[PDB]
Amino acid sequence: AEKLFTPLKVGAVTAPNRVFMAPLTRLRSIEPGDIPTPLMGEYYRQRASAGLIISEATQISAQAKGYAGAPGLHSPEQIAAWKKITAGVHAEDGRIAVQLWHTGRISHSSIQPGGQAPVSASALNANTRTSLRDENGNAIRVDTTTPRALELDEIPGIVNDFRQAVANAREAGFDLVELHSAHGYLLHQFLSPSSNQRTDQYGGSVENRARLVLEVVDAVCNEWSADRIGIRVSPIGTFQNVDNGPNEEADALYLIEELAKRGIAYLHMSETDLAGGKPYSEAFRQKVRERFHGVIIGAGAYTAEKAEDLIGKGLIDAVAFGRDYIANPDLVARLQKKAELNPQRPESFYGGGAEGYTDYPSL
Ligand SMILES: Cc1cc2nc3c(=O)[nH]c(=O)nc-3n(C[C@H](O)[C@H](O)[C@H](O)COP(=O)(O)O)c2cc1C
Numbered sequence: 622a623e624k625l626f627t628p629l630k631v632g633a634v635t636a637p638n639r640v641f642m643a644p645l646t647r648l649r650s651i652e653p654g655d656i657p658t659p660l661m662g663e664y665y666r667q668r669a670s671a672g673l674i675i676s677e678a679t680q681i682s683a684q685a686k687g688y689a690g691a692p693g694l695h696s697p698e699q700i701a702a703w704k705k706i707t708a709g710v711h712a713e714d715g716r717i718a719v720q721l722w723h724t725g726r727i728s729h730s731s732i733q734p735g736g737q738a739p740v741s742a743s744a745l746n747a748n749t750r751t752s753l754r755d756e757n758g759n760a761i762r763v764d765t766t767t768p769r770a771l772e773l774d775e776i777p778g779i780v781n782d783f784r785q786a787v788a789n790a791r792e793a794g795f796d797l798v799e800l801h802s803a804h805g806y807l808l809h810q811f812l813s814p815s816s817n818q819r820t821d822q823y824g825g826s827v828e829n830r831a832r833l834v835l836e837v838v839d840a841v842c843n844e845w846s847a848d849r850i851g852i853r854v855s856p857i858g859t860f861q862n863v864d865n866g867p868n869e870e871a872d873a874l875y876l877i878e879e880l881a882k883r884g885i886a887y888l889h890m891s892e893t894d895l896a897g898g899k900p901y902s903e904a905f906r907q908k909v910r911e912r913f914h915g916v917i918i919g920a921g922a923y924t925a926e927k928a929e930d931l932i933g934k935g936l937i938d939a940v941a942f943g944r945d946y947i948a949n950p951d952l953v954a955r956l957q958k959k960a961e962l963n964p965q966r967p968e969s970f971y972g973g974g975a976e977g978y979t980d981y982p983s984l
């Protein structure tokens with residue numbers, strides 16, 4: 622069609638096209654153990670024609686767990702299972718990044734270590750729901766538990782958990798890592814004034830609110846290499862009840878300038894929540910583009926036409942598609958041929974088994 626099907630260097634790897642698979646929580650891991658499965662391996666292998674696969678959000682630690690059925694990357698059994706998944710993608714000549722998260726306050730005590738309260742920047746309930754499993758293994762929605770504020774002396778341990786999870790990602794065969802700094806999860810809970818009322822060096826000013834994420838970026842670049850690190854941000858608008866405060870544009874540009882200093886592989890911008898939000902102006906896209914010198918990935922209700930427009934204008938380099946990738950394993954070939962897409966079945970986005978997961982056909 623036009624530029625979507627052309628190669629792009631993304632840090633240490635080269636994508637053959639600009640059609641990426643966005644990170645998508647599907648809640649099909651084995652419990653106990655939060656272990657990836659052969660069925661997950663098949664799902665990712667089906668999608669290996671993507672320019673880059675970004676995995677579902679994956680826990681850096683047991684404390685990081687927010688949803689029943691989300692996988693981890695902290696135990697030996699998890700590492701071994703992910704190695705099989707990455708090897709399947711590579712057998713199909715694909716590339717895969719792991720999205721690493723800590724859910725912070727979007728969690729429930731029943732899935733935390735010891736059954737205790739989850740942690741956050743401050744002791745404020747998320748006022749949302751998470752997904753648990755019932756006695757028959759089926760996904761159910763439950764109100765989030767009020768968190769405890771992290772003590773200052775606990776912050777280095779959070780940094781260390783990200784560091785260790787990146788070392789584990791490298792062993793598991795991932796090509797890149799994506800830090801989950803978006804959507805109201807732990808790193809975003811520190812970034813946003815709505816969720817961060819701290820009076821130490823980790824709250825107040827934008828420099829203090831960004832301190833934790835930038836300590837994490839520095840630690841993971843040191844552990845592996847900057848050209849292996851990406852980050853997902855959602856810095857404009859409201860996401861899962863977390864807004865970006867009264868100075869969101871200036872605060873976003875500060876963060877992006879700081880990330881640029883580290884020479885990381887990519888910046889992945891989640892532009893809108895699933896419930897919608899105001900579109901990015903071209904002027905703001907230009908301000909982002911002049912501050913970041915790696916790859917920029919756009920996401921959020923994109924069409925191929927919008928992607929072509931913005932790639933052609935030189936404002937973004939690639940697009941991540943979420944729900945179209947759930948339903949279309951061969952999305953690249955379908956967009957290239959202008960073929961129809963399979964219809965989406967949202968009732969099977971979370972939990973369950975093969976149905977609504979590996980049963981969407983290729984052309
Ligand atoms: C079922 C589902 C699960 C999601 N899980 C994640 C997640 O693990 N990590 C993340 O950063 N975003 C997650 N998202 C957001 C998607 O990555 C994506 O930004 C969003 O679906 C909008 O893009 P789309 O219109 O192309 O689907 C999820 C979205 C859906 C629909």
Ligand SMILES: O=[N+]([O-])c1cc([N+](=O)[O-])c(O)c([N+](=O)[O-])c1
Nearest residue numbers: 646647678688722801803804895
């Ligand atoms: O539905 N989900 O399970 C879901 C999960 C995650 N995540 O990282 O755990 C997200 O970032 C989003 N999201 O950003 O929209 C959705």
